[PDB]
Amino acid sequence: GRVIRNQRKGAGSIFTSHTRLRQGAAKLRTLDYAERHGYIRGIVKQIVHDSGRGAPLAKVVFRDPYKYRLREEIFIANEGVHTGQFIYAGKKASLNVGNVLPLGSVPEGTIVSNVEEKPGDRGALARASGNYVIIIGHNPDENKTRVRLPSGAKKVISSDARGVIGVIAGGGRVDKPLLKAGRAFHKYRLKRNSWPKTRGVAMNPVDHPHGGGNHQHIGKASTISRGAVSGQKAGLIAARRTGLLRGSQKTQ
Amino acid sequence: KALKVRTSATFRLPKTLKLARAPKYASKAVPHYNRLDSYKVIEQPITSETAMKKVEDGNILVFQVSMKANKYQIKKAVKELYEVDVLKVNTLVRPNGTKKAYVRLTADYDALDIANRIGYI
Amino acid sequence: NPLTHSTPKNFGIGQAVQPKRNLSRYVKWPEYVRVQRQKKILSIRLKVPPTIAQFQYTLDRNTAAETFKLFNKYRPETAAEKKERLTKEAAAVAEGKSKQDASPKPYAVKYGLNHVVALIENKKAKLVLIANDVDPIELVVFLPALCKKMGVPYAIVKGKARLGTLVNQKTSAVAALTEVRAEDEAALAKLVSTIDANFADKYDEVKKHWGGGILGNKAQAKMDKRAKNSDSA
Amino acid sequence: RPRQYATVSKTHKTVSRAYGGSRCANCVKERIIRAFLIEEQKIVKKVVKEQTEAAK
RNA sequence: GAUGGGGAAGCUCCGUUUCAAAGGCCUGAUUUUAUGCAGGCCACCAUCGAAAGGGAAUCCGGUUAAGAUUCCGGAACCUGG
RNA sequence: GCUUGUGACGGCCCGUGAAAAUCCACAGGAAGGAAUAGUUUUCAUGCCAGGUCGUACUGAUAACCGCAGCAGGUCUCCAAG
RNA sequence: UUGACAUUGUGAAGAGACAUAGUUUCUUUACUUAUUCAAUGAAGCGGAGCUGGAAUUCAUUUUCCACGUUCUAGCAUUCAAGGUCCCAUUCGGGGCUGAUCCGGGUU
Ligand SMILES: [Mg+2]
Ligand SMILES: [Mg+2]
Ligand SMILES: [Mg+2]
Ligand SMILES: [Mg+2]
Ligand SMILES: [Mg+2]
Ligand SMILES: [Mg+2]
Ligand SMILES: [Mg+2]
Ligand SMILES: [Mg+2]
Ligand SMILES: [Mg+2]
Ligand SMILES: [Mg+2]
Ligand SMILES: [Mg+2]
Ligand SMILES: [Mg+2]
Ligand SMILES: [Mg+2]
Ligand SMILES: [Mg+2]
Ligand SMILES: [Mg+2]
Ligand SMILES: [Mg+2]
Ligand SMILES: [Mg+2]
Ligand SMILES: [Mg+2]
Ligand SMILES: [Mg+2]
Ligand SMILES: [Mg+2]
Ligand SMILES: [Mg+2]
Ligand SMILES: [Mg+2]
Ligand SMILES: [Mg+2]
Ligand SMILES: [Mg+2]
Ligand SMILES: [Mg+2]
Ligand SMILES: [Mg+2]
Ligand SMILES: [Mg+2]
């Protein structure tokens, strides 16, 4: 049989990202003297669309502490952040929408975006338009802070790991129906070549585990083992349940 | 005493002294003679009827010239070989893979004379 | 004063580009630099077995200075001196019928590793100087044991290269003394005595002493303010 | 066009006031006033917190 | 797609600023003299890849069996010096 | 009116629609500069130079690809009543 | 994927035998130098001390925090001005200080 579609995606020919128009990597300021002892001020000089990304970016300008020059960073614009605003990044920085602060320095209930996994990794969690993490606690000895991620997960990271106060702009984007093939077409055209999607049940056997038959049917359980092997995993992988979810989900 | 004071966090390759070659023996023995001289630059007149015209009516000499020779060398070697003064040289590559020069002299020199001085008609 | 103005600078983050400082502690050194330094560190952090680590007990500058000034008389023939010598005995012996003894019995420092070893085995050495260097440390480590079992007094000297200078090499790795002119006999006795009590006599004790295990000061000061506070309140 | 700006005299590339061929002269007025006021109120902050250090 | 590298029995595969001691400009110091040292920089890390993308500057008239914004005539302009 | 160019606006997007060479300007004030005469070549005029390779013609029911002077195929500009 | 052996080292507590001295072996939890991961044109790390001050003094300090920036879409660069010492007064120019000490473990 052939190599199925989800295997071909891995060698990255037609499947790489369509990156030409993107504004850049969105990162927090490198974690340096200023940010970890003090704060440092910058101005958002622009807030701009990023191609293939649902949330705006904020180009933020800072002085360079060690040389006469301007160093420009690209944040992910938090909702309510505006052009000309002053942004404060540092341990001793005040708590307002747009500032970047170590998680250890904010009371619980603070809502924070683009938050680092390890301190100084220049941001990881809750970057998509509309998401955010909450601080659900701190353990000052072996200093940690506990956060609830957008997935619902709870995770404990270093109290020095930096967030940025508030939620990411562009929320509600998924509420509007695409309405037609083209609107989706133009969507992935700026992301990657994932669209459209042939049902593996409409292929021949050589093509897919679900292929073939004199009627379209999966022919064997579509829940596949974690321990399955490449070319086997097409289906609901490692699924621990299945069927229409009835009842509220909402982690305890 | 104590340690040097480096103002920069970067460490660059020390600037070491670079010696010039003093060869124990010579490269090529005798140096090659001039590869493009005035006699090699300009190979023949071009006596076509239609090139002949350019000599009478245009004050232009028409030469078959080395493929290795540029406007400069075609001009200097014409000046040197024919005693004449050159306004501007135009060149082209003939379809048989030979380079043709249109040499326009200043109004001080008369090509037709200078053409049948070298002896073609 | 006159048109001049005192206008100090606020280097306090948030303002005033920092000045130029000594970043020497932060320099990103060539790999080869980082290795020779981290080798030294790595050699200190591991517990060092006692048959190494009996080095790092170098002779002390005073005793060694007395040992270098004594040894320095006994340098071997320079090329000039030996050419000068041959012309003497070449003429004098082949002519004046001397026994090929037209030259005196030499007194010089012995050296080279395979030389000094069979010397120690033959009990002809009265003093052996061993380097604290010698990167294939194997070439040397057995000498404290050998000198001990053969009753030869020895000392571990800083400067394998300084052993070189006195012997007219770049590096000698060992220098030994066998002979002595009677004028120097008495200082050697006292020199061997001090050295014997810093090395050979101590040896049987040093053989039980592991070295190393030394924390870096970021971790030393760390637990020094841990083991200070948590016990004594 | 950009390389043509080397074929023209500097008075085609500027207007007289400082930040001439650079900012729009309402924008220069803005950063004149803003400069003066912020340098002034800076002094207003030095002497007030100097009093706070004397009285406290 | 070379390079310090890292794989691979190996043909070669990986990497492209990557775990590398990665280079050159403005002038001074020469009045043994031709260019060493003196500062201060800049740390940009190959290169190939568009005859439809970007891009310094030319026009009209005339002329040939067949060339023309290229020749001839007139009138310009750009770049370097 | 037709073709084209262009402006000021307006509709559209979970699409908001390249890069680099290169050129200019500003902030800065390092420095160099006049009266027995200095500074100025971003004002005008004036001098010299501008290499290498392509340049013919066909571009199609006969100059290309279809075994061929094949009813097929093969990117585009100009466009009168 | 799971186990064992190797890479594989240092403590400490607790189990375990010659059968209740310590050579040894495993469980817990420490360690950092191997190995591993992130970051940066390896820039401010660790230790101490100045000054402040909350602090209550059971003789006096027994300590813990700090220890230049937040109305404003400005400006922040020439080893820094200041101070002070040097050169033999030329213009130029250099130390120290401004900018506290100690350890070179970039974090
Ligand atoms: Mg297959
Ligand atoms: Mg990509
Ligand atoms: Mg597709
Ligand atoms: Mg489908
Ligand atoms: Mg589907
Ligand atoms: Mg089918
Ligand atoms: Mg199958
Ligand atoms: Mg199956
Ligand atoms: Mg089927
Ligand atoms: Mg079905
Ligand atoms: Mg030509
Ligand atoms: Mg103007
Ligand atoms: Mg390659
Ligand atoms: Mg190219
Ligand atoms: Mg082109
Ligand atoms: Mg073009
Ligand atoms: Mg014409
Ligand atoms: Mg024609
Ligand atoms: Mg002309
Ligand atoms: Mg010019
Ligand atoms: Mg737009
Ligand atoms: Mg301009
Ligand atoms: Mg001019
Ligand atoms: Mg043509
Ligand atoms: Mg044609
Ligand atoms: Mg054929
Ligand atoms: Mg046809």
From Swiss-Prot, chain A:
GO terms for cellular component: cytosol; cytosolic large ribosomal subunit. There is a cross-link at residues 45, 92, 118, 144 (Glycyl lysine isopeptide (Lys-Gly) (interchain with G-Cter in ubiquitin)). SMART domains: Ribosomal_L2, Ribosomal_L2_C. It is found in: Cytoplasm. The modification Phosphoserine is found at residues 51, 94, 158-159, 248. Keywords: Cytoplasm, Isopeptide bond, Phosphoprotein, Ribonucleoprotein, Ribosomal protein, RNA-binding, rRNA-binding, Ubl conjugation. One of its GO terms (biological process) is ribosomal large subunit biogenesis. Its main location: cytoplasm. The keyword rRNA-binding applies. InterPro entries: NA-bd_OB-fold (IPR012340), Rib_uL2_dom2 (IPR014722), Ribosomal_uL2 (IPR002171), Ribosomal_uL2_C (IPR022669), Ribosomal_uL2_CS (IPR022671), Ribosomal_uL2_dom3 (IPR014726), Ribosomal_uL2_RNA-bd_dom (IPR022666), Translation_prot_SH3-like_sf (IPR008991). GO terms for molecular function: RNA binding; rRNA binding; structural constituent of ribosome. Component of the ribosome, a large ribonucleoprotein complex responsible for the synthesis of proteins in the cell. The small ribosomal subunit (SSU) binds messenger RNAs (mRNAs) and translates the encoded message by selecting cognate aminoacyl-transfer RNA (tRNA) molecules. The large subunit (LSU) contains the ribosomal catalytic site termed the peptidyl transferase center (PTC), which catalyzes the formation of peptide bonds, thereby polymerizing the amino acids delivered by tRNAs into a polypeptide chain. There are 2 genes for uL2 in yeast. Belongs to the universal ribosomal protein uL2 family. This is Large ribosomal subunit protein uL2A.
UniProtKB/Swiss-Prot annotation, chain B:
It comes from the Eukaryota. HAMAP family: Ribosomal_uL23_A. Belongs to the universal ribosomal protein uL23 family. Keywords: Cytoplasm, Isopeptide bond, Ribonucleoprotein, Ribosomal protein, RNA-binding, rRNA-binding, Ubl conjugation. It holds the Pfam family Ribosomal_L23. This is Large ribosomal subunit protein uL23. It is found in: Cytoplasm. One of its GO terms (cellular component) is cytosol. Signal peptide: none annotated. PANTHER family: 60S RIBOSOMAL PROTEIN L23A. There is a cross-link at residue 40 (Glycyl lysine isopeptide (Lys-Gly) (interchain with G-Cter in SUMO)). Component of the large ribosomal subunit (LSU). Mature yeast ribosomes consist of a small (40S) and a large (60S) subunit. The 40S small subunit contains 1 molecule of ribosomal RNA (18S rRNA) and 33 different proteins (encoded by 57 genes). The large 60S subunit contains 3 rRNA molecules (25S, 5.8S and 5S rRNA) and 46 different proteins (encoded by 81 genes). uL23 is associated with the polypeptide exit tunnel. The keyword rRNA-binding applies. One of its GO terms (biological process) is cytoplasmic translation. It comes from Saccharomyces cerevisiae (strain ATCC 204508 / S288c) (Baker's yeast). Its main location: cytoplasm. The keyword rRNA-binding applies. SUPFAM superfamilies: Ribosomal proteins S24e, L23 and L15e. GO terms for molecular function: RNA binding; rRNA binding; structural constituent of ribosome.
From Swiss-Prot, chain C:
Its main location: cytoplasm. It is found in: Cytoplasm. Component of the ribosome, a large ribonucleoprotein complex responsible for the synthesis of proteins in the cell. The small ribosomal subunit (SSU) binds messenger RNAs (mRNAs) and translates the encoded message by selecting cognate aminoacyl-transfer RNA (tRNA) molecules. The large subunit (LSU) contains the ribosomal catalytic site termed the peptidyl transferase center (PTC), which catalyzes the formation of peptide bonds, thereby polymerizing the amino acids delivered by tRNAs into a polypeptide chain. Keywords: Cytoplasm, Ribonucleoprotein, Ribosomal protein. Present with 238000 molecules/cell in log phase SD medium. This is Large ribosomal subunit protein eL8A. Signal peptide: none annotated. PROSITE patterns: RIBOSOMAL_L7AE (PS01082). InterPro entries: eL8/uL1-like, Ribosomal_eL30-like_sf, Ribosomal_eL8-like_CS, Ribosomal_eL8/eL30/eS12/Gad45, Ribosomal_eL8/Nhp2, Ribosomal_eL8_euk. One of its GO terms (biological process) is maturation of LSU-rRNA. Disulfide bonds: none annotated. Transmembrane segments: none annotated. Gene3D superfamilies: 3.30.1330.30. Belongs to the eukaryotic ribosomal protein eL8 family. GO terms for cellular component: cytosol; cytosolic large ribosomal subunit. GO terms for molecular function: RNA binding; structural constituent of ribosome. It comes from the Eukaryota.
Curated annotation (Swiss-Prot), chain D:
It comes from the Eukaryota. It is found in: Cytoplasm. Belongs to the eukaryotic ribosomal protein eL34 family. Component of the ribosome, a large ribonucleoprotein complex responsible for the synthesis of proteins in the cell. The small ribosomal subunit (SSU) binds messenger RNAs (mRNAs) and translates the encoded message by selecting cognate aminoacyl-transfer RNA (tRNA) molecules. The large subunit (LSU) contains the ribosomal catalytic site termed the peptidyl transferase center (PTC), which catalyzes the formation of peptide bonds, thereby polymerizing the amino acids delivered by tRNAs into a polypeptide chain. Present with 23600 molecules/cell in log phase SD medium. There are 2 genes for eL34 in yeast. Component of the large ribosomal subunit (LSU). Mature yeast ribosomes consist of a small (40S) and a large (60S) subunit. The 40S small subunit contains 1 molecule of ribosomal RNA (18S rRNA) and 33 different proteins (encoded by 57 genes). The large 60S subunit contains 3 rRNA molecules (25S, 5.8S and 5S rRNA) and 46 different proteins (encoded by 81 genes). This is Large ribosomal subunit protein eL34A. It comes from Saccharomyces cerevisiae (strain ATCC 204508 / S288c). The gene is RPL34A. The chain holds residues 58 to 113 of 121 of the full protein.
